[PDB]
């Protein structure tokens, strides 16, 4: 799109690695350095996708 197309989503930030051919569907909020952001604000707790 000229100035849109925000539905094509991917991963640019996450902490843990996954093993070869391992299965994962998670989309949970990321931690904030401190204890994680359970549906609330924090330091950054940037989104997975």
């Amino acid at each position, epitope marked *: 799109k000229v*100035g849109g197309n*925000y539905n*094509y989503l991917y991963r640019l930030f996450r902490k843990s690695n996954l093993k070869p051919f391992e299965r994962d569907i998670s989309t949970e*909020i990321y931690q904030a350095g401190n204890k994680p952001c359970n*549906g609330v604000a924090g330091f950054n707790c940037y989104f997975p*996708l």
Partner: antibody, heavy 123, light 108 residues
Framework: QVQLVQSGAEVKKPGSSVKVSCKAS????????ISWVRQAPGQGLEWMGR????????NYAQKFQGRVTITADESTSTAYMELSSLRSEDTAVYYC????????????????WGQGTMVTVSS | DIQMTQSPSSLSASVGDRVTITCRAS??????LAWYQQKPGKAPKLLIY???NLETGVPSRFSGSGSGTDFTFTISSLQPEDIATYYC?????????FGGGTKVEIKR
């Protein structure tokens, strides 16, 4: 079960910036890209508004750009739409829906629609 | 003006009729297209979300196919519950508009 809900039916007036709200239930609000559908009696689907709450980016249709705004407030778990310069064509059953079909492996088809309301703007 | 149209405004047919009806647009596309069914003032049904693809809930009576500027909506049988309208909407680009569709009634 996932579900979205707007507030009770109400009246909207032109010539001002009105604040419309609707909540999402089932998983964090940040997980779904929310789309607003002004389904009219004759016309069907709409794309006048799409917002990804956590990235904060939003796009609108050529009919609504410039004068509208969307704001997501996770404190109360709500997504807001600032609407202004209304026309008489707005008589439609409004829904705020989930366009979250990117993690599904399917290219952005709508899956969950809210209960929606019959907005009252006409005479 | 990317818009699709139908030719028999009021398509009439009895229960169990073979119809190969078409939705034509000014520009042809190979993807990002779907078809719906809808009542007056009610949400649309997710009948055909992709080219020649049928999703869950669709009866065997209806099916879709085609290519280019024209797409064929195949009807092996028209049930009496089908007092409704079809649509041939596209979502390829940003400046979108909705289709016109066709009206359906049961020949009696």
């Amino acid at each position: 079960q996932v579900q979205l809900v707007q507030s009770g039916a109400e009246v909207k007036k032109p010539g001002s910036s009105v604040k419309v709200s609707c909540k999402a239930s089932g998983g964090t609000f940040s997980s779904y890209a929310i789309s607003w559908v002004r389904q009219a009696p004759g016309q069907g689907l709409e794309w006048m508004g799409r917002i990804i709450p956590i990235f904060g980016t939003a796009n609108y249709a050529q009919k609504f750009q410039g004068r509208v705004t969307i704001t997501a407030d996770e404190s109360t778990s709500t997504a807001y739409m600032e609407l202004s310069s209304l026309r008489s064509e707005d008589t439609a059953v409004y829904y705020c829906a989930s366009l979250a079909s990117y993690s599904s492996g399917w290219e952005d088809v709508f899956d969950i629609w809210g209960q929606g309301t019959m907005v009252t703007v006409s005479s | 003006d990317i818009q699709m149209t139908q030719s028999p405004s009021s398509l009439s047919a009895s229960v169990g009729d073979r119809v190969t009806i078409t939705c034509r647009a000014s520009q042809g596309i190979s993807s990002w297209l779907a078809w719906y069914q809808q009542k007056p003032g009610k949400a649309p049904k997710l009948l055909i979300y992709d080219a020649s693809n049928l999703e869950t809930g669709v009866p065997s009576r209806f099916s879709g196919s085609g290519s280019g500027t024209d797409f064929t909506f195949t009807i092996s049988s028209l049930q009496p519950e089908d007092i409704a309208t079809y649509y041939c909407q596209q979502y390829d680009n940003l400046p979108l508009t909705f289709g016109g569709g066709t009206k359906v009634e049961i020949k009696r």
